[PDB]
Design a binder for this molecule. Structure first.
Ligand code: NDG
Ligand code: NAG
Ligand code: NAG
Ligand code: NAG
Ligand code: NAG
Ligand code: CL
Ligand code: CL
Lengths: 401, 405, 403
């Protein structure tokens, strides 16, 4: 009959349509809602928006950094501009008196470490799953805001805390004093001053460095702020199926052991400033020298701004393959109640007015022992291609007998 | 040979037959996501609670005598404490009520106290509209929670029909103006489970088939703001063992004190059991027929026990996912109230000071972004019916090949 | 044998089960996260909550609109209710003196345009991806709130701005003065007055008109407000697979180029008011006459409220098939810090108290170079039905070859 010619014509033609499918390298995305007996609680990094406490700024610091913080002009004088408070201008005309004064050596990293807000003074109260925690439970981390702190860091081999139930009771609750009376006076616009009072916060996997100035959320004074979270786990496929970049212990990055958009970007930033400024900012990795006030103002602040705003050539940062995202729903209530104000004032030896202006509470917790997963899977595996081609080859071989 | 082209035909069906049985016995599932365009949505329940549990003006000498220690207004010696964290004018009203010379205790009930001294929705609710229809205090059913006397709008309880949203946007939702009544806030002289540092309300948006769990799962709304809450209905289906870990939701709940299964119901059940076992009482907000805890039992046994339970213990409370489950995505945003312009009008309209309006008025708009719910349904991967429809057709061609040769 | 009796019965039976599947018209929904080198930054429309600046309300305006703004009663005189500010009641008793006064002609649209807050006065500062922008980067748009503004409108052939990187640095940051001292005094409840200070904001596709009073979010004075966004792209299938309405070269709407729930609704609203009131509101399209204060109060305000609240018959607006959604996470910090207050006061020649009451900052930006897609795809295509019927027709033609 015609059947052996028309069985070879259809087999070899349909066989090359299951090979044109494979070589397109399709993927398919599986969504799931996994019920979880327990979840790993994330890292919570948090920063005061004020970088330098006024009371920690020495004559020597003012001498070196005063122009960078717009407290001095280029002539080491307190400016013509009377943005100053009367009582503040007295304290500062003193510090800014440089007659007979001999400069001592100065280091931006030291200054940040010494003058940065102290978690020990800021942290009025802290609880996790009902257990008390202290300033010892927060590891120091440097960010563009300066001396910041990470709760449940996972760093120093201490074990990562876990959430076993839904609701606020199985989460973090911290009361802070943002210390507005230590806020450095703002007499000019710079990258180191802000118009704002409160803290920046980032909730992130322990495996990701914080990127708090770009990806953080804000928490205001005078409110208890509830943050209800949801763990989202995302898997992506490498080339040729997608564009992602393996998360392993061989990062392939100058300054990081594991790949992450954040690590990739901090790497790229650090490289760029070292190349163009011959220094790194106090928060960047490597062993390059720390920038001086002059270098911050003249080279580094502008360069870093140029980089994260304009330049699109220098920073090529691809998706990681493993990635953990946190959905957040914020809500707030006022603190303090008219009733509670006097108790809080007395409990902390502050004015009632001060409590209103400086106290906040932050509750971070999960809605439900559940994570969304969104995994990209290979559409048509190479194994399953030879398991069709094996069965295509087996019946045209059964047509010859 | 011609019988061997048959022997390679039998080896393939018996081998592939036990690979489609090893697949079935793995009990795989597959998850279908969908974005159904909806003519109509059932508007959820909205439970809301003042953060202040007891109005100061409702606390009698008898109440202060029994509960004063629990609310840190008294020490264990029925005296106003050493530490003068009191306001001068406030302390005057209380010196009187706290005078217990000659006084004989009269009978006292935590449930009654909560009911009598709790904020009245009738006094709190300055204004309320749903899809442009007016509603009053009559539209809010009373419910007891750890915060005390709370209220649920669109409860579905008392056979009243569940309200529906037919368009997106704020205009087809709830808008309520409240006065949180800070001047009735019980003075806070010490830390307890019944006092808070905060003013405002807690709110929970939830299915009518869920009891509220407002202290754990609620969101906050502050005074001095209009707060927009833009919602999205999410419907989740899960598969029971052996495919998953869920426990079917029907009207045969299988729970001591509840109509339908829900993590919330399951947890309140488990909490009620635990306190009865370890305290020989229930809290005013728990179901069952056990006696209500006394202030003494609240302070000594129940408050610490319930805290122990929801914080530390992971032995006692095994509460599994329901199979049917309704979630609400929310985006909150706010504007200031009142404007400098509106302040005098609101003061006059409600016979309050301008300062008072600033401190006590809030507006809440709850509404849906779009006539749409997300569904996320787990479906059985390989049904048992479709297994007999493969193994019957696997068995039927080699029995067709042995009949020929 | 019995094989030809059993083999045509199985073709015809399986054939009509794969035709009962097709005629059910199933669909399947594909979810994805695509890694994006770049995204189109959306439109950002924003409105002051105060519709008419006090200082722009002329004697002529008060004469025509005073009742609509509850500054006059139905006898076009100032009410005797002593619930004005003392100094405001003076300025207004003056304006409200109509002895000797000759009416000049009046237009709600002109009034809105003239008395609406000026983006040029409100916009203290504005940056996108670090580049400076001015009042000229915001196109005027009329909404129920009145004179509003859209950033990155895409209108007037200007090109749509793009986001290249995640985080606040690659987004919009605007500092506003909401001008509370220009807020029209509230002596009564109407659809044009509000109890609230701040702005309403909507983030939306450039292809969608804003629907800011219904679908907007609020931004309060005295805070920097971070809005972190996520682009969600939704595809739906038309009947018989679903209920959507394909976006074409013919919008199918009297007054819009492209279909969109928002366009569809504004269309339907415009039709309804013209039919029932013989006017349109200043923010509606078409060529109908603009409503007068009297028409606003008596017919149009109540009609539009009736429409968006109660009526369920008149406005049949079905899902578009192509559709862009923006997930948002808001957070805020206080402005100004005790430290910054005097600098801001001096920089803008305002009191320190004023700064607290009127200044806000808004940052709109994307968390990650990623959009979620949710595409409905046809379950069983009509092509693939003839490719199964062709393979069942091929083996009983192999069974009639034997017999
Ligand atoms: C109100 C309600 O529970 N609806 C449904 C129910 O009809 C259905 O049987 C179930 C399927 O698992 O999903 C859920
Ligand atoms: C990476 O993802 C896989 C899931 O495919 C998971 O098993 C593993 O825990 C993840 N590892 C890291 C380092 O993120
Ligand atoms: C409390 O603070 C005051 C400032 O108001 C200070 O002078 C005093 O020494 C402090 N006293 C105690 C008891 O801490
Ligand atoms: C207004 O309130 C006060 C109570 O503080 C009262 O003296 C006055 O009589 C009230 N008038 C009313 C409700 O009209
Ligand atoms: C939908 O329209 C948008 C907006 O212009 C465009 O990006 C997209 O390509 C369209 N896609 C489909 C499948 O209609
Ligand atoms: Cl700091
Ligand atoms: Cl910017």
């Amino acid at each position: 009959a015609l059947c052996f010619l028309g069985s070879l014509a259809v087999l070899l033609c349909v066989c090359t349509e299951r090979v044109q499918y494979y070589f397109h390298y399709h993927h398919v995305t599986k969504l799931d809602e996994v019920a979880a007996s327990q979840l790993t609680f994330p890292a919570v990094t948090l920063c005061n928006l004020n970088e330098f406490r006024f009371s920690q700024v020495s004559k020597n610091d003012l001498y070196h950094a005063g122009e960078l913080l717009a407290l001095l002009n280029n002539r080491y004088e307190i400016p013509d501009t009377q943005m100053a408070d009367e009582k503040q201008l007295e304290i500062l005309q003193d510090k800014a008196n440089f007659r007979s004064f001999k400069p001592k050596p100065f280091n931006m990293r030291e200054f940040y470490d010494r003058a940065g807000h102290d978690i020990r003074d800021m942290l009025l109260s802290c609880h996790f799953r009902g257990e008390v925690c202290s300033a010892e439970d927060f590891k120091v981390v440097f960010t563009r805001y300066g001396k910041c702190y990470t709760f449940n860091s996972g760093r120093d081999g201490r074990p990562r805390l876990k959430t076993m139930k839904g609701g606020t009771g199985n989460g973090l609750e911290i009361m802070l004093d943002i210390q507005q009376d230590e806020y450095l006076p703002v007499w000019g616009e710079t990258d180191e001053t802000s118009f704002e009072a409160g803290i920046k916060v980032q909730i992130h996997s322990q495996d990701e460095p914080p990127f708090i100035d770009q990806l953080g959320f804000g928490v205001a004074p005078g409110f208890q702020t509830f943050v209800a979270c949801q763990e989202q786990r995302l898997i992506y496929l490498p080339p040729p199926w997608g564009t992602c970049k393996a998360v392993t212990m061989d990062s392939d990055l100058d300054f990081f052991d594991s790949y992450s958009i954040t690590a990739c970007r901090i790497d790229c930033e650090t490289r760029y400033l070292v190349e163009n400024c011959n220094c790194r900012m106090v928060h960047m990795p490597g062993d390059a020298p720390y920038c001086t006030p002059e270098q911050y103002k003249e080279c580094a602040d502008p360069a870093l701004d140029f980089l994260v705003e304009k330049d699109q050539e220098y920073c090529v940062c691809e998706m990681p393959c493993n990635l953990t995202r946190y959905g957040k729903e914020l809500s707030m209530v006022k603190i303090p109640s008219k009733a509670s104000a006097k108790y809080l004032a007395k409990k902390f030896n502050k004015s009632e007015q001060y409590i209103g202006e400086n106290i906040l509470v932050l509750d971070i917790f999960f809605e439900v022992l559940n994570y969304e997963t969104i995994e990209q899977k290979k559409a048509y595996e190479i194994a399953g291609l030879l398991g069709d081609i094996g069965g295509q080859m087996g019946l045209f071989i059964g047509a010859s007998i």
